[PDB]
Amino acid sequence: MITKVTARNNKITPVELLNQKFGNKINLGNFADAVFTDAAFKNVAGIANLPMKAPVMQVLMENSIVSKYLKQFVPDRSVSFVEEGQKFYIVLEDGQKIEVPEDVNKALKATVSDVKHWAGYLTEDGEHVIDLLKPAPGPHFYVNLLIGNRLGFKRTLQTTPKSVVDRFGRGSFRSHAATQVLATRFDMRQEENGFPANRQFYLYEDGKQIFYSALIDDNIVEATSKHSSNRTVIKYKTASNLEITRTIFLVPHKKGFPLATELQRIEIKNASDKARNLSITYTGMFGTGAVHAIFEDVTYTNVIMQSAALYNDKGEFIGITPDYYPEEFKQDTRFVTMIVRNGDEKSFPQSFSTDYNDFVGTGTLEHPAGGSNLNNKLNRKGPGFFALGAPFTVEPGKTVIIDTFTGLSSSKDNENYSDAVMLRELDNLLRYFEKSESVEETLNEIINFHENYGKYFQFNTGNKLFDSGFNRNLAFQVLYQTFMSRSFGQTQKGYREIGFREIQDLFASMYYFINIGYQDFVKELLFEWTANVYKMGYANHNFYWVGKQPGLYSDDSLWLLQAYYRYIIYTKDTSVLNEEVPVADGNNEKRAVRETLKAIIQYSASISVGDHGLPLLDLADWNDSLKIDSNSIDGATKEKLYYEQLKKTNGKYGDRFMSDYSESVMNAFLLKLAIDHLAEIATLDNDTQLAQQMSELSKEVTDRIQKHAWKENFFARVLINRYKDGSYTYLGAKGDKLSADPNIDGVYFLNSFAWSVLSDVATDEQIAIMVDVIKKHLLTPYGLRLVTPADLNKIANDTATGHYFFGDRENGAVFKHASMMAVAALIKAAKKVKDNELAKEMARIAYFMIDLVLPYKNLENPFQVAGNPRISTQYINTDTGENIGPLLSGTATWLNLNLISLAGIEYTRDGISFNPILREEETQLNFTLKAPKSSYKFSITKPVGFARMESSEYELFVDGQKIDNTVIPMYTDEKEHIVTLKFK
Amino acid sequence: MITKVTARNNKITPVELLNQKFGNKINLGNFADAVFTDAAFKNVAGIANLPMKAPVMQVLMENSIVSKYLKQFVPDRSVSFVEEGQKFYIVLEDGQKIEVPEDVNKALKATVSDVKHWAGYLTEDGEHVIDLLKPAPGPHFYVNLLIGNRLGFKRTLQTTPKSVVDRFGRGSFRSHAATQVLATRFDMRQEENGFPANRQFYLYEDGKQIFYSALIDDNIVEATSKHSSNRTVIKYKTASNLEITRTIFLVPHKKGFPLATELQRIEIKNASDKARNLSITYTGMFGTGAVHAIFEDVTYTNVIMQSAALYNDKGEFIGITPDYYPEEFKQDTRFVTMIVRNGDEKSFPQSFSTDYNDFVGTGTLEHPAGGSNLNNKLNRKGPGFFALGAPFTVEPGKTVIIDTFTGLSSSKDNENYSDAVMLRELDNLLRYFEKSESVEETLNEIINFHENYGKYFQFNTGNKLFDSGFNRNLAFQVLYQTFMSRSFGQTQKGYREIGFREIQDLFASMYYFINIGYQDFVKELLFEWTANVYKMGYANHNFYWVGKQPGLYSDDSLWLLQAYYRYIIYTKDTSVLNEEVPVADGNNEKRAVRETLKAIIQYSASISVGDHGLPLLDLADWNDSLKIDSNSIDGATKEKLYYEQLKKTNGKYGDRFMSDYSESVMNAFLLKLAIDHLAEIATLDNDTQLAQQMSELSKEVTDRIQKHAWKENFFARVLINRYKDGSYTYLGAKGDKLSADPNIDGVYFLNSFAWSVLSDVATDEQIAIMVDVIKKHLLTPYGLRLVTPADLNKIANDTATGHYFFGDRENGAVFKHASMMAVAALIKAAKKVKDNELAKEMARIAYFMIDLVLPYKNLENPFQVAGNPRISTQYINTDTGENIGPLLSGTATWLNLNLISLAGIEYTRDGISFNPILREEETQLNFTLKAPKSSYKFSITKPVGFARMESSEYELFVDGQKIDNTVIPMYTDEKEHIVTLKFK
Numbered sequence A, B: 001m002i003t004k005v006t007a008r009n010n011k012i013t014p015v016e017l018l019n020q021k022f023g024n025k026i027n028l029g030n031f032a033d034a035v036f037t038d039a040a041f042k043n044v045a046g047i048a049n050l051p052m053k054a055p056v057m058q059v060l061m062e063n064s065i066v067s068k069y070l071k072q073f074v075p076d077r078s079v080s081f082v083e084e085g086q087k088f089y090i091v092l093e094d095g096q097k098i099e100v101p102e103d104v105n106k107a108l109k110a111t112v113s114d115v116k117h118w119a120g121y122l123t124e125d126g127e128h129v130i131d132l133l134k135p136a137p138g139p140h141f142y143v144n145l146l147i148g149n150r151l152g153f154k155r156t157l158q159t160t161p162k163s164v165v166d167r168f169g170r171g172s173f174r175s176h177a178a179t180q181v182l183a184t185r186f187d188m189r190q191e192e193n194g195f196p197a198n199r200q201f202y203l204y205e206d207g208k209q210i211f212y213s214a215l216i217d218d219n220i221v222e223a224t225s226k227h228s229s230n231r232t233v234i235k236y237k238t239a240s241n242l243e244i245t246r247t248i249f250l251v252p253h254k255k256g257f258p259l260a261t262e263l264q265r266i267e268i269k270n271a272s273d274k275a276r277n278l279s280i281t282y283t284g285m286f287g288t289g290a291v292h293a294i295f296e297d298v299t300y301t302n303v304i305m306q307s308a309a310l311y312n313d314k315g316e317f318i319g320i321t322p323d324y325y326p327e328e329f330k331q332d333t334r335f336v337t338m339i340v341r342n343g344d345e346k347s348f349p350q351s352f353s354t355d356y357n358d359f360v361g362t363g364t365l366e367h368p369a370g371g372s373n374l375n376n377k378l379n380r381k382g383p384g385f386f387a388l389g390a391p392f393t394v395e396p397g398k399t400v401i402i403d404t405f406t407g408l409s410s411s412k413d414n415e416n417y418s419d420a421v422m423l424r425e426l427d428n429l430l431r432y433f434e435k436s437e438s439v440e441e442t443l444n445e446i447i448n449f450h451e452n453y454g455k456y457f458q459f460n461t462g463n464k465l466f467d468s469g470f471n472r473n474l475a476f477q478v479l480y481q482t483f484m485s486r487s488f489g490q491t492q493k494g495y496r497e498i499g500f501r502e503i504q505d506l507f508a509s510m511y512y513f514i515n516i517g518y519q520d521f522v523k524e525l526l527f528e529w530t531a532n533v534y535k536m537g538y539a540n541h542n543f544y545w546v547g548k549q550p551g552l553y554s555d556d557s558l559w560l561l562q563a564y565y566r567y568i569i570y571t572k573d574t575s576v577l578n579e580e581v582p583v584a585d586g587n588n589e590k591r592a593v594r595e596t597l598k599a600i601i602q603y604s605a606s607i608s609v610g611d612h613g614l615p616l617l618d619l620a621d622w623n624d625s626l627k628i629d630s631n632s633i634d635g636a637t638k639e640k641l642y643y644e645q646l647k648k649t650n651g652k653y654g655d656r657f658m659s660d661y662s663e664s665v666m667n668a669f670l671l672k673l674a675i676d677h678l679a680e681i682a683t684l685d686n687d688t689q690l691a692q693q694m695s696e697l698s699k700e701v702t703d704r705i706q707k708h709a710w711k712e713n714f715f716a717r718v719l720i721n722r723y724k725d726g727s728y729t730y731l732g733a734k735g736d737k738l739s740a741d742p743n744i745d746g747v748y749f750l751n752s753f754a755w756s757v758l759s760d761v762a763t764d765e766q767i768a769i770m771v772d773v774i775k776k777h778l779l780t781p782y783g784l785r786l787v788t789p790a791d792l793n794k795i796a797n798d799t800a801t802g803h804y805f806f807g808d809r810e811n812g813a814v815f816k817h818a819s820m821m822a823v824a825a826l827i828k829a830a831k832k833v834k835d836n837e838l839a840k841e842m843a844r845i846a847y848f849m850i851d852l853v854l855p856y857k858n859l860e861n862p863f864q865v866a867g868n869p870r871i872s873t874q875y876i877n878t879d880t881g882e883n884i885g886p887l888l889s890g891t892a893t894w895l896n897l898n899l900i901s902l903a904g905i906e907y908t909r910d911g912i913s914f915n916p917i918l919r920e921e922e923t924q925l926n927f928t929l930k931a932p933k934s935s936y937k938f939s940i941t942k943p944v945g946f947a948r949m950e951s952s953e954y955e956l957f958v959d960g961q962k963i964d965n966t967v968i969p970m971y972t973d974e975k976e977h978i979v980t981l982k983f984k
């Protein structure tokens, strides 16, 4: 009877039908655009020969002239526009080619003129300049992320403020945890991160609205946004020649300031020849303290608060705070205030409103009926809407500056807390920013801070999009993730705690912090993670103010050894091993770091091991889909059962916990690497007993992995111990019986390869075999997928049926973080394997995958690949090529590590092991490197083709002297050293 | 330094300052309005002599002419408008009185002309006619609630669809449980129940937007909404003489239909002399199946679905369905479709869009840039936005009708479910509604159904607002609550299950259902609740598809005896006692209803009792604030401990569970009443042993209550057993030591009074004493508060600090449900106490409180009292007098019972015990009453003053014969009986 046609099973696309109908009467070029003319998809209207994919038909249909013209033909007749000799025609299927009227021609020419820049462009410094009218490639593309600075202050991870800002300034602003200053929105669209009023304002003249910052109409003749490092600047010009500029940034902390302040400076320049009598109404919505009640009891959120007015020492109104009745919502205190600077005069708002209904009245948010006559009524209820009003006359050629300060004070940074604390901190803030120039000086301080931070590693290549993308944008993102982990963004809006394994972000950022004088901060972070390890050696899976989920995931603790290794090898500071740090078990017990690292290794190498002596998988490891064991236990439960086991079987602590639980081969690799790291740390610390014990244990673990986890053509991913008849014994290689793809024998996990190499277990022949499998079955046109198709229902009855269409997340996506771990392995192997042809191939795959993750390349074909050209995104949809959010992800961290690795830098016992792997087409690579007490200029030259030190002739010079030792010293002479490498 | 002034701490109001500055130069009358002119509140602009409180200054300030005129004086000078001799002046503080210009005079006159009706008015049939421009008193005031009809089909409570509709048609639409058809919004404002596009549409002409159903601009010359019983009709007239009418209702179920369908009919009449070529774009937003992910993972909500197009047998597009990948979201299937009826022609949509971003484009939702050129693109992702487009030419004087059908099919009503089921049900629906007249016939069927349902009890007084308010509006609300409990509304948006104690709704509705032939449905509901009682006698606190929270709250089971009593006494159907009903414990065990009722009584009378033999309080009872015992246990835990106790101490089942837990006196009253009810049921069932046992137990329980719970001047509320030194021993009367008000000795709970009377425990002297306490300490200007101020931290030695400002919810509100239980007691006592002066006073309090809850009276002073003039609201804020939502509440149920009781109707063993209690100023009361096999016309006459049968002379006649027996027979002769009562 009735039939259903889904988006995906729709049989033909508009552009395909356009080609079918017109592809032999006109040249459709390499790119075209088209729309179906009716809901049965029988006819199309399109346009030929575009420079890239873009929604041109949509923009044309918004044009009254072209839309009316098309109605002469559509829907009954298909049509294509075509340009010949710089004039436009419309072509019909019956052959006719009609020269379109002049007004249609002008509209078509204007529309196609700059299609290649419709998603914006990057400045030389890597800043994204966006047109406020153009369509968005996707909901993360036009987004900037802002952060405060709590370095030098307490609990930096938990207290640094953070904000998200789209091209219109939309978004939200948080203090500690998920505490909302400006309101988040949890609604249907990814595009709506915040309440729509946030950061927006109106201008009035003669009682009539002339401007709204989130409405572009015909009275706006220019409107652009620029996303830069830690600030966004939005500019408009009206037809009446008002020039409006918004600058948004977070205030770096200073003693006595509120815990969170966001500054928005608005500059209004009268570029006309007549004075104008204007007024501003600045609006927003405070976040509720009662977030769960938005879902559960909206009336509660309203009745528990009221608005309150703030007055300075002269009795002048300065702004609004939402005042709460319940004590639990009085431990933070929000505020908004504004200063109007008009020539000599400084003024504060003359009126306000605090009730959204009274403000909008009979109008809309874009055209509010009460916006020009604020009612000065303090709302007895929430929500905490605010509007602040002030008049100003602006003379010809002159500018008025309005500085807004939005923020929160908190008990999280102040003992004996009450709203009196907020009032004092707000006074301190406003006094600091009393002089107009103070805002500019703070912005310059922010700019200079991030510029200085980035100097640890600077590329200088022929490609300024790459150089700025790495030197500024990626460096900023890695700082951002060190402070924020995975806890905030455009679509990351729920409360998220810090995952233990996300210590990974510090793997990349620690060098940057050390080289701006914050080595102690790095140590503090190491110790903070260490305090989340239990005596037995498992870890809290998550923490924020305190830790939770003891030993729930089996991989967590092992990552901490990589962090300590990187820190100790770089700095040679073994003193951290003697630090007495609280154990996660509490009471009031502390343990030296060295003993905690030993315990981590013992847990995974000896206690929590399965029948093959490899680490147990438990609930899951790094991969949350490996819910193979449905009766798994956490570390606290395991600890209790273990002690009962020792008592019942007369065992000794350190003996194996006996079970038929499955084993994680990825954890085995993480462990082997961790053991190697501790052996090397111990040697540096002159701890001969520990070095020897760890060296021998590494050999033993390596033997277990080789004997029990190499399965013909790959390292397995999981060993299965509960089927004593052999029905299933492993997952992750040929013969595992678990493939869901009839054309693939076995399931293959990218991380089995990656971690077998990163841990230095895989032999050269094993690498060659695995790379062959990867090329055949894991390498897609959009990069390296995480795993091939698996049918885990055969062993994990528990198993979730799928949630995703093909291409998204677990149904076949390219997870870019995992792809970057695999690239790290490809790079490491390409430097060392004996066979130069294997090395060359692995480096080709490495650069192919890097090219698919570099954010700036998202502007090459933005309406297909989307993403964000300054900030990583999490995955590539393998059906469409679209880069899909969220923004914060391990991709950025590992991309940073990988590009530095390819440039040749690895820190080792005796200095910098230098071994660069350039692109085949590159003939030069230059970069600078900072160290704590010296600096370096590196220059590499080669002919076209694959070159590497292992197999190619070369000459290496340091400070003008030819040298054979490729381990460059870590100099401490406070001089710049010149390193030159020439491949012959 | 900086100071803070809250809404509540603000010293003086605008109107107070207006009177201070002007009150003896002009007559400000009984009502005025004013606004502060600046943020320091020094000056005011106001207007004198309004007919009621209303936001007149706000509306005047939206008027460009008046706003500009005021700027000649404000902000520096205070002003008041005044009308004298039908012309307006503005008065200044210096005494100047200036005749305002003619254009300002016209604007002021027009604005004040109809202030008395700014919040709308009620038709004679109780329908609320609302102006779409006027401000709202509050966020529940302009709301209607719609319901489907699943009578005669399975799982009626769980499957009846329901919708909320404001005056603009905003809101949302649900199927079973919290399953969203059209999307709910969980955001900052109580006003936003749904995604803003829901139910809204646009009209176009020559490619330009001429109308949006949720935008009133100057091209709209009339715009009104009418909320009636189970439908809303919204009407507009454009300046171009288009007349647009929207009619929204839910389709009653028919076999083969989808489980939920909402019909919106749009009629467009061309009342001009020229044909118009128009088009409509009909929009909305499907709700997500993944509601939790709106908060947790918005990207997930998008990627798990895609849009899909629907086609009829002829290959014509008919509408859209959102298609889901995960199996858990494929068990419901949503749809939207539309039919355009233009003269002889019927047509389906010619175009669609399914991507909000493409639809809005560079515009706004009110003015979407893609609305006139839908792109016919099926979105690969959610959210499930839809727009359906169709053209039509409408000739002069003619009408085009667009019928939209939005809905969902579900596995909850169909075995072997898939989307094929939806397609078949949608086909059935569209075939049924093929002919234009079918929509009108279905609407008339709905209207007639509710009119017939209401005939159980009809008032005929001189007061059509009261008569329609009761006969139509309250009757509908009580039906609504029987099907929906407390689970849906404007601000009730989270998932809520059916509370066991909300069987109370059936106390009022059962008589209505029985008198339309649905006695079997009433029995089925009795059995459904009965299946949520455990063998031991405690109950699941909540249920929906299954029950949960076994015995968590101590009162729950006792309410079931009231439902069985009302049913059995009305119908004399004792057969229900023999029904074998599943026990809540499961394991396929059943028990006869009679034995379950016995078990309920045994649990509260013998097992779960404290040191005084009164029922234990447990976590809490009816009052969720009585968290007195911090180590309480649920019934499952108690059952386990009880059996352990019996074994340890060699006890027998039925012995007391031993503890120092506190006792609930309200539960003791509910129990005493329950026992009396079972004794009477048993006597009717000729079960002499059970009747004797219950009669004796009632005496025993009464003695326990009198001996241990009467405390000098009140029945206590809780007896406390854990302080053996006597430090605290009770809560709820003089001497309890728990008052938080230094001027009150004791805490007094309204329900201690109410239930002491409803259970026939309180003596006449106890009633006199308690009513004196109530008058002194519980009766406020806004009605009966629930409790006086208490300091429970002294015994719950640390429970929650308060959450509310004074006046709201637990901080002193008038909870209208509890107020109506107290009124039930006052009425019962007024009928029977010996002292006529006590009776008179109690009846005065009863009618005072009724007047404060009757919805239609919310239109007397609507901008102060708000509420909703057709639907109850939950509480009155005792600081402001505002009636605050939610809408569904026990208020409506008990208001219905109380008004019928006051009219004199109580069903007893031998018929109708007739004992009416009229208002003192009433001289007449007439009403009709339906019974299953007869009907009645009642007429009561009296002189002015208090009259009642107990104390006043009267003559009673039935069918023209004077009778002395005031128990009127329940006649079964299928005749109308005339009952006349004349007080002398």
Ligand SMILES: OC[C@H]1O[C@@H](O[C@H]2[C@H](O)[C@@H](O)[C@H](O[C@H]3[C@H](O)[C@@H](O)[C@H](O)O[C@@H]3CO)O[C@@H]2CO)[C@H](O)[C@@H](O)[C@@H]1O
Pocket (backbone or CB within 6 Å): A289, A290, A291, A292, A293, A294, A296, A297, A300, B624, B803, B809, B810
């Ligand atoms: O519905 C039962 C009772 O509700 C009480 O209001 C409660 C709110 O509904 C509830 O949301 C809130 O609980 C949280 C809130 O959800 C969360 O956002 C915030 O972080 O903490 C709040 C702490 O409670 O609690 C209140 C009060 O308990 C009504 O007061 C009551 O009438 C009603 O029976």
Ligand SMILES: OC[C@H]1O[C@@H](O[C@H]2[C@H](O)[C@@H](O)[C@H](O[C@H]3[C@H](O)[C@@H](O)[C@H](O)O[C@@H]3CO)O[C@@H]2CO)[C@H](O)[C@@H](O)[C@@H]1O
Pocket (backbone or CB within 6 Å): A624, A800, A803, A809, A810, B289, B290, B291, B292, B293, B294, B296, B297, B300
């Ligand atoms: O965050 C860890 C993993 O998340 C996975 O997506 C999950 C969604 O975030 C989660 O919302 C969903 O769970 C619910 C959903 O919350 C609720 O609305 C609905 O009723 O049921 C959903 C069923 O689960 O689950 C998915 C995963 O199943 C990512 O897939 C994964 O990459 C990530 O590690």
Ligand SMILES: [Cl-]
Pocket (backbone or CB within 6 Å): A051, A112, A113, A114, A115, A116, A117
């Ligand atoms: Cl171009």
Ligand SMILES: [Cl-]
Pocket (backbone or CB within 6 Å): A140, A488, A489, A490, A491, A492, A885, A886, A887, A888
């Ligand atoms: Cl994000």
Ligand SMILES: [Cl-]
Pocket (backbone or CB within 6 Å): A622, A623, A666, A749, A750, A751, A752
């Ligand atoms: Cl993995």
Ligand SMILES: [Cl-]
Pocket (backbone or CB within 6 Å): B140, B488, B489, B490, B491, B492, B885, B886, B887, B888
């Ligand atoms: Cl509600």
Ligand SMILES: [Cl-]
Pocket (backbone or CB within 6 Å): B622, B623, B666, B749, B750, B751, B752
């Ligand atoms: Cl109570």
